[PDB]
Enzyme design. Structure first.
Site, PDB file in Angstrom:
ATOM      1  CG  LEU A  77      -3.665 -15.298  -3.520  1.00  0.00           C
ATOM      2  CD1 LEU A  77      -3.539 -13.728  -3.282  1.00  0.00           C
ATOM      3  CD2 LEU A  77      -4.689 -15.714  -2.788  1.00  0.00           C
ATOM      4  NE  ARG A  78      -1.675 -22.670  -4.367  1.00  0.00           N
ATOM      5  CZ  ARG A  78      -1.102 -23.097  -3.506  1.00  0.00           C
ATOM      6  NH1 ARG A  78       0.178 -23.265  -3.748  1.00  0.00           N
ATOM      7  NH2 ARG A  78      -1.696 -23.178  -2.565  1.00  0.00           N
ATOM      8  NE  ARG A 103     -14.478 -19.455  -8.080  1.00  0.00           N
ATOM      9  CZ  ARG A 103     -14.791 -20.558  -7.905  1.00  0.00           C
ATOM     10  NH1 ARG A 103     -14.481 -21.768  -8.072  1.00  0.00           N
ATOM     11  NH2 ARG A 103     -15.599 -20.455  -6.432  1.00  0.00           N
ATOM     12  CB  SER A 151      -9.395  -9.383   3.565  1.00  0.00           C
ATOM     13  OG  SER A 151      -9.100 -10.526   2.612  1.00  0.00           O
ATOM     14  CD  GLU A 152     -12.425 -14.142   1.700  1.00  0.00           C
ATOM     15  OE1 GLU A 152     -13.006 -13.497   0.870  1.00  0.00           O
ATOM     16  OE2 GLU A 152     -12.063 -15.296   1.603  1.00  0.00           O
ATOM     17  CG  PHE A 183       1.112  -4.093   7.926  1.00  0.00           C
ATOM     18  CD1 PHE A 183       1.654  -5.143   7.156  1.00  0.00           C
ATOM     19  CD2 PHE A 183       1.107  -4.637   9.358  1.00  0.00           C
ATOM     20  CE1 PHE A 183       1.863  -6.382   7.429  1.00  0.00           C
ATOM     21  CE2 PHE A 183       1.516  -5.897   9.592  1.00  0.00           C
ATOM     22  CZ  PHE A 183       2.030  -6.830   8.545  1.00  0.00           C
ATOM     23  CB  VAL A 228      -2.644  -9.339  -1.555  1.00  0.00           C
ATOM     24  CG1 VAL A 228      -2.896 -10.562  -2.369  1.00  0.00           C
ATOM     25  CG2 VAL A 228      -1.313  -9.283  -0.991  1.00  0.00           C
ATOM     26  CB  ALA A 229      -6.002  -6.443  -5.120  1.00  0.00           C
ATOM     27  CE1 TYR A 231      -2.581 -14.104   1.581  1.00  0.00           C
ATOM     28  CE2 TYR A 231      -4.346 -13.150   2.771  1.00  0.00           C
ATOM     29  CZ  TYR A 231      -3.498 -13.163   1.567  1.00  0.00           C
ATOM     30  OH  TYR A 231      -3.786 -12.059   0.749  1.00  0.00           O
TER      31      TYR A 231
HETATM   32  O1  LIG Z   1      -1.137  -0.271   3.596  1.00  0.00           O
HETATM   33  C1  LIG Z   1      -1.535  -0.030   2.648  1.00  0.00           C
HETATM   34  C2  LIG Z   1      -2.707   0.047   2.390  1.00  0.00           C
HETATM   35  N1  LIG Z   1      -3.410   1.031   2.086  1.00  0.00           N
HETATM   36  C3  LIG Z   1      -3.368   1.882   1.063  1.00  0.00           C
HETATM   37  C4  LIG Z   1      -3.900   3.186   0.929  1.00  0.00           C
HETATM   38  N2  LIG Z   1      -4.561   3.423   2.030  1.00  0.00           N
HETATM   39  C5  LIG Z   1      -5.282   4.722   2.084  1.00  0.00           C
HETATM   40  C6  LIG Z   1      -6.104   4.637   3.332  1.00  0.00           C
HETATM   41  C7  LIG Z   1      -5.808   3.700   3.782  1.00  0.00           C
HETATM   42  C8  LIG Z   1      -4.787   2.765   3.271  1.00  0.00           C
HETATM   43  C9  LIG Z   1      -4.031   1.822   3.149  1.00  0.00           C
HETATM   44  C10 LIG Z   1      -4.458   0.829   4.505  1.00  0.00           C
HETATM   45  C11 LIG Z   1      -3.575  -0.073   4.944  1.00  0.00           C
HETATM   46  C12 LIG Z   1      -3.989  -0.919   6.225  1.00  0.00           C
HETATM   47  C13 LIG Z   1      -5.140  -0.201   6.934  1.00  0.00           C
HETATM   48  F1  LIG Z   1      -5.413  -0.801   8.210  1.00  0.00           F
HETATM   49  C14 LIG Z   1      -5.980   0.560   6.521  1.00  0.00           C
HETATM   50  C15 LIG Z   1      -5.722   1.194   5.207  1.00  0.00           C
HETATM   51  C16 LIG Z   1      -0.335   0.325   1.314  1.00  0.00           C
HETATM   52  C17 LIG Z   1       0.722  -0.545   1.455  1.00  0.00           C
HETATM   53  C18 LIG Z   1       1.867  -0.090   0.198  1.00  0.00           C
HETATM   54  C19 LIG Z   1       1.297   0.655  -0.749  1.00  0.00           C
HETATM   55  F2  LIG Z   1       2.145   0.966  -1.511  1.00  0.00           F
HETATM   56  C20 LIG Z   1       0.174   1.242  -0.652  1.00  0.00           C
HETATM   57  C21 LIG Z   1      -0.729   1.207   0.375  1.00  0.00           C
END
Ligand SMILES: O=C(C[n+]1ccn2cccc2c1-c1ccc(F)cc1)c1ccc(F)cc1
Ligand SMILES: O=C(C[n+]1ccn2cccc2c1-c1ccc(F)cc1)c1ccc(F)cc1
Ligand SMILES: O=C(C[n+]1ccn2cccc2c1-c1ccc(F)cc1)c1ccc(F)cc1
Ligand SMILES: O=C(C[n+]1ccn2cccc2c1-c1ccc(F)cc1)c1ccc(F)cc1
EC number: 2.3.1.-
Lengths: 396, 396, 396, 396
Positions: free
Chosen positions: A91-92, A87, A115-116, A396, A79-80, A120
C-alpha cells in the site's frame, strides 16, 4: 514484486483481486465502464515475479469547493492488496507512486472514500465531509404551518419511472453539483450505472421509483427484508420549495413505517416537521477524504467568508511547506516564507478544514492544530466556514 | 377544575401524580430536596372540584450564554396532567399561568428538557442544545502522535471514590459552568442527589467510580446488563490536557469492550484517536429548550462574534414585537421600531438560535425564518455563532 | 406396501419424495450424477399398492481408517419415508434389506451422516467423527513467534479461481484422504458437483475463491447476509507449513471481522495464535457414523498404537458374536471363541471406537461398554487411539 | 512508582482497585476471607509516589496431578493495574517479583484463571484444562437402556437445602479432588463463600437447591431472566452410578426446557442419552493455566501411562534448562544434561502438556513443540496422557 502500469493482459487479474477484495463489486462489464474515467498512467499493479497481488488507480474528477469553484481532483479508488501479501508495504509503495504521478500531472487535490477510518490519515488524507442517516417515523410526521408548499391546488411532484426521465435528473444534478461544496461532475457512464441499478434484481434489490419536481428529484426503493422501510438512495434539490415538496411526497408513502436517507448534518428536514425528533439520526460517518497535493494552489482556489475582516498569519504544514497566508474579501494569497509559524498542522488536518466540515477550534482542542493565539483560531474558524453546507456527491 | 398555587396539603397528591407520570421518579425525600429550588408561587396545581389532576412549576436557575454571561432562568419542570384528564386544555392553562408569573418576576428566559419533541414548540420553546451519544470500541483505540499527555513519567489522573472528593468535583464543575454556553449553577442539594446515585443499588445500578485530574473529572459505572460496557454519566474538563488525560484513563478500562457517553456535537474525542470512526455516534437528540421571555433583554445580554462587521436590521418575532437590531463589537442594541421587518420568525426559532446550536441558514431553508436578503442570513449565522461550543449541564 | 429395487420408471417419484424430504436437494440433474456412485441393487423403494412412499440406497465408498488402510464402505444415503406413511415400520424394513445386501456383497463397514442424532444407534450405527466449528475474530489475530512461514520474502499461497485449478485441488485432496482416518475417495462426479457450487447463485450464495499452496488449499466465500463473515467450505493441508500458510492468507482477509470453518477437535489453529481464545468453538456435532458389518474383518483391518504392549481379551458384541481379540505390534487377530467375555458392548459403541474419536474409558463411564478390569479399559483406550487425528471427508 | 509488600493501611486501596477492575467483586468482607489463603509476603502492590495503582498475590493451593499426586501450587490471583497506569510495565514488574518469591519458597508450579487469553503465555503460563458448557434440551432427553440406575424401587438422590448438608458436600468434594487431575483442596472459608451464594439475592440470583447421592451432589438454580433454564453451578460425582443418578434427577426438572453445566470435554453425559446431540456444546474455553516453576521437580512428581514402554530423550525448555528425561513404569527421572536436545518447547507449552489436556502431536503441528523424531512425538503423547480425565476445580 515489481510496481508498474497495467497492460491489457493485467485487467482480468485485477478484476479477480477486485471480486475477492470488494463485497460491492458487480463484475467486468461494470468495471470496464468505470475504467473510462481512469487516465493513461492512472493505474499501478504489483505482480509476484504471474498474478496481480496489488493495485491502485485514480480517476479524473471535478470537485466543487466553497465559492462555487471547480477543482480538477484525483479520485483514488480500486485499491487492493491480496490477502497473501499483507504487511509487505505494498500500500505505502502504490500510494507513493500514485501521489508522484498525481502531483506531476498538476492536480491540486486528491480524494477518496475510506473502507476503514484508520488507513489514510498517515498518507495525508483528512475526512472532509460527514454523512448522516436520518430515519423518519412517517406515521407521526406532520409538516409545520411555516413549511413551504402547504397551500391548496395540485402537487408539482410526479411519481415516475427513473429510466424515462434521465435528462431531467441529469439537468437537476448538474445545477446541484455546481452550487454545493462536495459536488462532483457525474459523467454519462455513471448515469448508465445509476439507472441499471434502479431496475429490480432477481432475489436482490426491488424496483426503484422517482419523485420529480422542476427543481429536484428523489430516487427510492423499498428495502429487501423490511417491507415497511423505504430507502432514499439519492435526493437532489436546488430550491427549499423542491426539498419540502419531495419530503411531502415521501411522508405520503402511507404503506411505509420508516423513510431512511443518507444526508448531511445541516439537512433542514427536522425543521419542516412539528416534531424535530421524528427525524432520528441512526448513523454518522466520514464521507469524502481530501489530500491537499499543493497547499498554495488549493488555499488560493477556494472562496472564504466575506464576514471576517482581512487578517495575515504563517501556516506550517508538517513536511508540506511554510506559507504567509493573507485572507481578505473572501480571497486568499498564499506565498513561501521562512518567518516563524503561527499555526502548525499535518496535511490531513488541512484536508479536513478545506470544505468547511470541521472547525479549526475543534481540531485545536485535540492538538491536531497548534497555535498560541486563540484570536487566530476564531479567525480561521470564521474564514474557512462555508455559507452553503458541505455535502457528499457519490461514492467512488 | 380550578388553577392555584399548591398548599402543604397538596404535595402528597403531587408526588402521587409524579410517581404515575414519570418513570425516573425516586420518591418524596428526593422530590423534597428539588423542592428547595422552587420559589414561593413557582408551582401551579389543578384540583378536580379532592385530588391533584395537573401540576407544573419552575425552578430558579442560572444559565451561562455566549460571552460567559449568566442569566437568571426559569427552569420549567415536574409538568404532569393525570391520565384521567387529557385533552381538557390543562397544559395550555398551567403553561399560560407560569409564563405570566415568570414574565412578571423579571426572568429574561425560561428553559426545559422535553419528554416528547412535539409539545413545547407551540408555547414558544425552541431546542437550543444537541446531545450526542458516542460509543468507543476501546479495544482498537490508539491515541494520535499529536494527542496531549503521551510523554513518559506518571499519570496526573487518579481513580477515586466519588463520595471522598465532592469539593474537587464542585470546584471543577463551577469553573466549567461559568465558561460554557448551556452551563447551569448546581446547588448543594443537586450534589447531595448526584453522590447518592453514585452508590450501588440492590438489584439496580452498580458502584460509580471517578477519574480525577486537577482540571477535570469523569464519573462512570459498568452497565447493569452489558458488563462489557462502561457508561460515563458525567465528564467535565476545563483544559484540553484534562480532557485527553481522562480519555486515556477511560480507554485504559481493559475489562470493557465499549465506553459510552452523552456529549455534544463538537466533542474533540474522535480527533484524539488514529481512527476517528472508533468513536461512533449511536444517538442524537435535542437537549435544553429555550423560551425567550423578553426579546430585547435576552438579545442585548449575550455576546456576539467580534469577527462579523457592524450591521443593522429589523427582527419581527411573531406575536412577540418588532425590533431594530444593531450588532457590532460583539454587543447588541435592540429597540422598539415600527419600520418594515427584514427578518420574521416565531419565538421558538429565536430560542434555537440563542446559544449558537442552530444556524439561521438551516432554519431559513425550512422557512422557520423568513428574509429576502441572504447577505443578512450570512451575517446572523456569523454573529449568533459561539466560539466556545454549546453544551448541556444536567437534566431537570 | 411392497419392498423392491427401483426401475427407471421409479426415479421421478424418488426425486419428488427427495424434494419434499430434504431441504438441501438441488434437483434431478445433480441427483443423476450422485446416482453413478450407487451400484446395481444398491437402492430399495416402497410403493403403495402407484407412487413411492419410501426409499434408501448405499453408494460404493473407500474409507481410510487408522494405519492408512482403505476399506470398501457402504455409504447409506437418500433415506426418506413419505410424511403420509410414518410409524409404519418402513425405515426398519428398508434398513434391514440394505444391511442384508451390504453384508452379502462383502462390505466390512457401512457409514452415514445423520439428519437427527436419535434414529441410527438402534440399527448399529455409532458416531465415529466429531465436527468443530471455529470462528476466528481475525481483527485481534496475531501469529505466535514459533508459527511457521513468518520469515521474509514472498508468500507461497496464491488467490485463484477454483474452476482453473481443479487438477491441483484433486492431487492435494488425494494425498490428504490416503493419510487421514475419515478420508473418502472423491470421484470425478463429486468434483463436478463441488466446482458447480463455487459459482455465484442469483439470489443465493456468492462467488467462491481458493487459496492454493503446493501442499494445501482452502475454498471460501463471504456469507449471503453477514458480509463481515467468510465461510471456509473446505481446507485440506498435507503439511503443517501448508496449514499455517493458508491461515496467514485467511487472517489477511482485512475486509472480514470473522472467519468460520467446520474442522475437527485436534485442529492446531488455536495454537498458531498468541491468543488461543480468538479461535472460539461456536458449534460441535457428530460427523460420520459407522456400522461394523463384520467385526473380525474390521478389527483385523485397521492398525493399532505400537506404544501399548501385546495383550489378549474376549470382546462380546451384543447379537454380533464373541471374539478372542489379540492386539500386538500395531496389528490385531480376531477369532471366534465361546470363552467368558471380558468386554461387552452393542455394535454402535464399536463403530464409535473404530476410528479413535471416542475413548473406551468415556463409554465405560456411561455403561455403554461393560468390563470388570480397568487395566483392560486403559489398554483398549491406548490401542484404538489414532496417531493422526480423525477428520470428516465430505457429507453424503 | 515503587514495588513492595502491602501493609494493613494498603488493603482499603486494594479493595478500591478491585471494585474498579473486577466485575465479579463482592466486597471487603468476602475479600477478607480469601485473604486468609494468602501467605505472609504473598502480595505485591505498586504505589504512586499515596494510592495503589497495581497489585498481585498468590494463594497457597494443593493441586492434584496425574497419578493422584498432590503438589503445593502458587495460585496467582487478584492481579490489577489501575486504568491510569497502563503500558507502564507494571504487570511485567509485579509478575517478576511474585515468580521470584514463589520459586524461592519452593513451589514446583504456579496456576491462574485468565481474564483474557493473550496476557499470560509470555510469562510461561500454558492453558492446562478445558471447560465445556453443555446445554441439554431435557424435553426430548430419554436415558439409554444401558444407562445405570434404570431399575425399579426408590431413587437414592434427595432434593435438599444446600446449607443443611455442608458436611456431606465437603466429604464428597474431598474424595473427588484427591482422585481427579485439576483437583484443588477447598478450605473452610471457600465453603463459607460457596453456601452464602446458594441463598437468594434481592434482585440478584435465585435460591440454590442440591441433589444429594451418597457418592455425588449437584448444586443448581433457575437463571435470573430465562425461567425455563436451570444452571448447574457444580456437579461432583465419585462413581458412574452417582453421575447417572444426578442426571436422572436433573432431566426430571419438568418445569425447565434446558439444563446448562460447565463440565470437561470427556463428560460421559452425551452417552447416557439415546440422542447424544441433545447435549449440545454451547461454549468451550481454557480453564486452569500452569507455569512449571521447576521442570525436574514437576516432571518427576506426576505419574505417566504404564502402557507406553520405557524410553529416553533430551527436553530443552527455552530459557528453562536442558534435561535427560527417562520415562518408564509410569515414573520419570529428569536430570541436567548438555547433550543435544531432541525436543524444544517454551515453558508455557510444557504447562499445557502437564495435566494431559493437550496432545504433544497437536502442539508439534503448530510448531510450539520442535522435534525431528515423530516416534518420540507418539511416545510423549502416550506417556503424558491421563487415564482419569482432567477437570477444573473452582475459579480463583
Ligand atoms: O469505482 C470503481 C469500483 N467499482 C468497480 C466495479 N464495480 C462494480 C460495481 C460497483 C463497482 C465499483 C464501485 C465503486 C464505488 C461504489 F460505491 C460501489 C461500487 C472502479 C474505478 C475504476 C475502475 F477502473 C474500475 C472500478
Ligand atoms: O426535577 C424534578 C423532578 N424530579 C423529582 C423527583 N425525582 C426523584 C428522582 C428524580 C426526580 C426528578 C428528576 C428530575 C430530572 C431528572 F433528569 C431526573 C429526575 C423536581 C423539580 C421540582 C420539584 F419540586 C420536585 C422534583
Ligand atoms: O447424496 C445424495 C443426496 N443428494 C441428492 C441430490 N442432491 C442435490 C443437491 C444435493 C443433493 C444431495 C446431497 C447429499 C449430501 C449433501 F451433503 C448435500 C446434498 C444422493 C445419493 C444417491 C443418489 F442416487 C442421489 C443423491
Ligand atoms: O479470589 C480472590 C478474588 N475475589 C476477591 C473478592 N471477591 C468477592 C467476590 C468474589 C471475589 C473474588 C473472586 C475470585 C474468583 C472468582 F471466580 C470470583 C470472585 C481473592 C484472592 C485473594 C484475596 F486476598 C482477595 C480476593
Amino acid at each position: 514484486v515489481t510496481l508498474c502500469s497495467p497492460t491489457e493482459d493485467d485487467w482480468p487479474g485485477m478484476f479477480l483481486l477486485a471480486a475477492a477484495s470488494f463485497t460491492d463489486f458487480i463484475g467486468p462489464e461494470s468495471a470496464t465502464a468505470w475504467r473510462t474515467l481512469v487516465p493513461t498512467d492512472g493505474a499501478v499493479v504489483v505482480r509476484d515475479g504471474s498474478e496481480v497481488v496489488g493495485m491502485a488507480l485514480y480517476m479524473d474528477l471535478r470537485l466543487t469547493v466553497p465559492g462555487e469553484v471547480v477543482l480538477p481532483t484525483a479520485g483514488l479508488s480500486f485499491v487492493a492488496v491480496a490477502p497473501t501479501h499483507r504487511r509487505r508495504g505494498l500500500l505505502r509503495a502504490m500510494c507513493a507512486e500514485l501521489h508522484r504521478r498525481i502531483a506531476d500531472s498538476g492536480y491540486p487535490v486528491a480524494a477518496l472514500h475510506a473502507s476503514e477510518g484508520g488507513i489514510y490519515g498517515r498518507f495525508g488524507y483528512g475526512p472532509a465531509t460527514t454523512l448522516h442517516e436520518l430515519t423518519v417515523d412517517r406515521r407521526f410526521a406532520r409538516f409545520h404551518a411555516d413549511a413551504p408548499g402547504g397551500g391548496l391546488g395540485g402537487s408539482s411532484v410526479r411519481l415516475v419511472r427513473p429510466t424515462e426521465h434521465r435528462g431531467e435528473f441529469e439537468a437537476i444534478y448538474e445545477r446541484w453539483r455546481q452550487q454545493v461544496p462536495g459536488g462532483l461532475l457525474r459523467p454519462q457512464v455513471l448515469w448508465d450505472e445509476l439507472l441499471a441499478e434502479a431496475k429490480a434484481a432477481p432475489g436482490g434489490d426491488r424496483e426503484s421509483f422517482a419523485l420529480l419536481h422542476p427543481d429536484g428529484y428523489a430516487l427510492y426503493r423499498v428495502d429487501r427484508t423490511d417491507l415497511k422501510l423505504a430507502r432514499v438512495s439519492e435526493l437532489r434539490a436546488v430550491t427549499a420549495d423542491a426539498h419540502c415538496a419531495l419530503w411531502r411526497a415521501l411522508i405520503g408513502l402511507d404503506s411505509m413505517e420508516r423513510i431512511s436517507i443518507i444526508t448531511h448534518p445541516q439537512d433542514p428536514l427536522p425543521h419542516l416537521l412539528t416534531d424535530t425528533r421524528l427525524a432520528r439520526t441512526t448513523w454518522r460517518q466520514d464521507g469524502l477524504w481530501l489530500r491537499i497535493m499543493n497547499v498554495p494552489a488549493a488555499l488560493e482556489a477556494r472562496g472564504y467568508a466575506h464576514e471576517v475582516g482581512e487578517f495575515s498569519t504563517v501556516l506550517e504544514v508538517s513536511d508540506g511547506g511554510r506559507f504567509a497566508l493573507k485572507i481578505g474579501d473572501g480571497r486568499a494569497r498564499c506565498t513561501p516564507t521562512d518567518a516563524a509559524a503561527e499555526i502548525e498542522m499535518d496535511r490531513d488536518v488541512l484536508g479536513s478544514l478545506y470544505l468547511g466540515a470541521h472547525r479549526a477550534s475543534t481540531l485545536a482542542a485535540a492538538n491536531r492544530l497548534r497555535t498560541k493565539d486563540s484570536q487566530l483560531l476564531r479567525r480561521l474558524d470564521a474564514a474557512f466556514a462555508s455559507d452553503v453546507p458541505v455535502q457528499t456527491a457519490f461514492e467512488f
